[PDB]
């Protein structure tokens, strides 16, 4: 039901060991499907359903767009660096935009930019305006509210974005609607009289998962500690959840895993 198209981009004065300074990437339903960077200079496919359904003119046009935006943000880094009266150092421009078709069937679109990791300027589609988060964004707002660029952005986020999302979702219907069952391992360690149970779910897809601990049949809302959902290197996901207990109550805990690839929730023990 839910489908998402999202493009994000980062320009940095200090990209770090091994890194290009400009990188923009796209995701469909959470899945990285296209990539561009300032070293390769070319927008390239990243899945097999986008490559199988795209010509070269698509990729050359995406590359031209990405080069235009690469120097747009090259200029923007210097512009903001001395707009803040800064004489070098570590600075970052980030942008993220896209559209969502939600589970009730309505559409939403968004676009927002950050300087140095904090909200810089956001798009209020409805007002066709640009809300400034900092004084230094009152300038950019004006530059972005002249001409019809705002209306073009609205029309992109409401029409172009959503139909390209629909087409991408059709291209990869088999791959994105796939389901991978996680394997759950329950482990245990005793430290200083406290027994700590770990529950690890390896290699599940899609990303939405609900892992809970249960003590004598009841979910331990406030006692579980989790590392969140972390990615595997292959399009699958991982998560671990720990809980503390007294040794001797160790066999009353059950790890319950709720995931789309399970018709019934998985119950696992130590």
């Amino acid at each position: 039901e839910l489908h998402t198209l999202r493009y994000i981009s980062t320009a940095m004065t200090d990209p770090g060991p091994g890194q290009p300074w400009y990188v923009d990437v796209g995701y469909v339903d959470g899945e990285l499907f296209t990539h561009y960077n300032s070293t390769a200079r070319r927008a390239v496919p990243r899945t097999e359903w986008i490559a199988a359904n795209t010509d070269q003119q698509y990729w050359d046009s995406e590359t031209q767009t990405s080069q235009r935006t690469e120097q747009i943000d090259r200029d923007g880094l210097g512009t903001l660096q001395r707009r803040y009266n800064q004489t070098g150092g570590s600075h970052t421009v980030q942008l993220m935009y896209g559209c969502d078709i939600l589970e009730d069937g309505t559409i939403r679109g968004y676009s927002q930019d950050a300087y140095d990791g904090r909200d810089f300027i956001a798009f209020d589609k409805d007002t066709m305006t640009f809300t400034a988060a900092v004084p230094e964004a009152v300038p950019t707002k004006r530059k972005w509210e002249e001409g019809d660029y705002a209306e073009g952005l609205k029309q992109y986020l409401e029409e172009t974005c959503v139909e390209w999302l629909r087409r991408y979702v059709e291209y990869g219907k088999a791959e994105l609607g796939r389901r991978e069952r996680p394997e759950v391992r329950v482990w245990g360690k005793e430290a200083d009289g406290i027994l700590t149970l770990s529950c690890r779910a390896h290699g599940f897809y899609p990303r939405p998962i609900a892992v809970s601990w249960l003590k004598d049949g009841a979910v331990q809302g406030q006692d579980a500690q989790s590392g969140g959902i972390v990615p595997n290197g292959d399009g699958t996901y991982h998560t671990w959840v720990t809980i503390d207990a007294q040794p001797g109550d160790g066999d009353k805990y059950q790890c319950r895993v709720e995931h789309a690839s399970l018709p019934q929730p998985g119950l696992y023990s130590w």
Binding site: T65, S66, R68, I72, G76, K143, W144, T160, C161
Partner: peptide
């Protein structure tokens, strides 16, 4: 498809 941007 990516969208076009403007200068900061």
């Amino acid at each position: 498809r990516r969208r076009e941007q403007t200068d900061y």
